[PDB]
Scaffold this active site. Sequence first.
Site, PDB file in Angstrom:
ATOM      1  N   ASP A 103       0.844  -1.186   0.000  1.00 51.49           N
ATOM      2  CA  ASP A 103       0.000   0.000   0.000  1.00 51.49           C
ATOM      3  C   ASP A 103       0.881   1.238   0.000  1.00 51.49           C
ATOM      4  O   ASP A 103       1.983   1.230   0.556  1.00 51.49           O
ATOM      5  CB  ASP A 103      -0.960   0.023   1.197  1.00 51.49           C
ATOM      6  CG  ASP A 103      -2.038   1.115   1.070  1.00 51.49           C
ATOM      7  OD1 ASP A 103      -2.884   1.013   0.146  1.00 51.49           O
ATOM      8  OD2 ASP A 103      -2.041   2.083   1.880  1.00 51.49           O
TER       9      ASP A 103
ATOM     10  N   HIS B 208      -8.088   3.902   6.496  1.00 58.62           N
ATOM     11  CA  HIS B 208      -7.124   4.365   5.471  1.00 58.62           C
ATOM     12  C   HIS B 208      -5.741   4.804   6.025  1.00 58.62           C
ATOM     13  O   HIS B 208      -5.061   5.667   5.436  1.00 58.62           O
ATOM     14  CB  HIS B 208      -7.744   5.454   4.576  1.00 58.62           C
ATOM     15  CG  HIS B 208      -9.245   5.409   4.508  1.00 58.62           C
ATOM     16  ND1 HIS B 208      -9.929   4.641   3.585  1.00 58.62           N
ATOM     17  CD2 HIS B 208     -10.193   6.041   5.247  1.00 58.62           C
ATOM     18  CE1 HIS B 208     -11.232   4.801   3.760  1.00 58.62           C
ATOM     19  NE2 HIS B 208     -11.418   5.646   4.760  1.00 58.62           N
TER      20      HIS B 208
END
Lengths: 203, 172
Positions: free
Chosen positions: A17, A175
């Site tokens: 990520d 997130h």
Amino acid sequence: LTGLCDRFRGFYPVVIDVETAGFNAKTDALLEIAAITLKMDEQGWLMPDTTLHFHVEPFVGANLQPEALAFNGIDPNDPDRGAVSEYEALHEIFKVVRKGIKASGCNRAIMVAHNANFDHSFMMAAAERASLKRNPFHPFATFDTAALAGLALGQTVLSKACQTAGMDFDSTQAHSALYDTERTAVLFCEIVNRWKRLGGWPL
Amino acid sequence: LTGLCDRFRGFYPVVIDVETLEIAAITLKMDEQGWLMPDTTLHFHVEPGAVSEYEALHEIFKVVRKGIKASGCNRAIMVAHNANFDHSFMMAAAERASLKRNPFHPFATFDTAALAGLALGQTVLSKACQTAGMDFDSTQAHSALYDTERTAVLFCEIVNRWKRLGGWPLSA
């Protein structure tokens, strides 16, 4: 057919990520990156292996435009970050991956992410800037867990895919890069394993 | 649970290939018992008897739009091999040709390179097809129509095997 190098034609999946200043891979800054390599036990089951994490500092010619930064509310040049260089993190990541590839018998790394191709393009442009000439990641292939999960569980959204897969998912932590990466990896493993479990693998 | 709008959270998958300028699209449907298969094929040669970029897209969209409405889905999703390549082009084209009602999701895509990876441990389309025991002639792989059709069959085959082994439903 035990062994990771036989599961994806020599590809060594690595869950990744990224967190960025803006949508543009060529211009906008890289702010954070997390990577988890995978390993496969003597039974052919897949699972996390190494986890790396970094806060990155904006590269030199970076886009540090008020309107662009304000947009996602982060200060890259905030000195209370523990950020290292683009090169440092990528160098270290690539280094682990390389060791992993060699020892695993694989021939190349492939990135695993949710909506993977966008993060992929960010981490390529960055390694180019870093001058990392030995970038072990395939230049266009990616395992995108969004599609995998759509096949595997009928869910396309990371949270919902996790929840359906039977694992739990904390929408508060959401997130933050490490958490994501970590969930994804587990989700990605479950999917691969579940495929073995239901007698999909081997053929 | 037996029907596209059940299988993919309401996405309507449309297999698409672009080649260089030529574009092919196949929509899918499900039988009474929930097996996936090709519904409609569309194929165009486009100038960047060749149709315009507007026509090709407008016609595809028209079909997709219709199929969605018929199958109670809510948006189209693009199935492709290394899908983001084709998906990018598409959306550009749609915009460039000023198209009012684009049914496709703006960034989500089912990439068969990855689905194949999982389902057959092969990434390349040709290899994936053969592993699945389908026919594949690479001389021909330069044709968008040939590629698409193979991709659609491959995709249906992946989705259907999953059912066959019992990975779907999850539990009606």
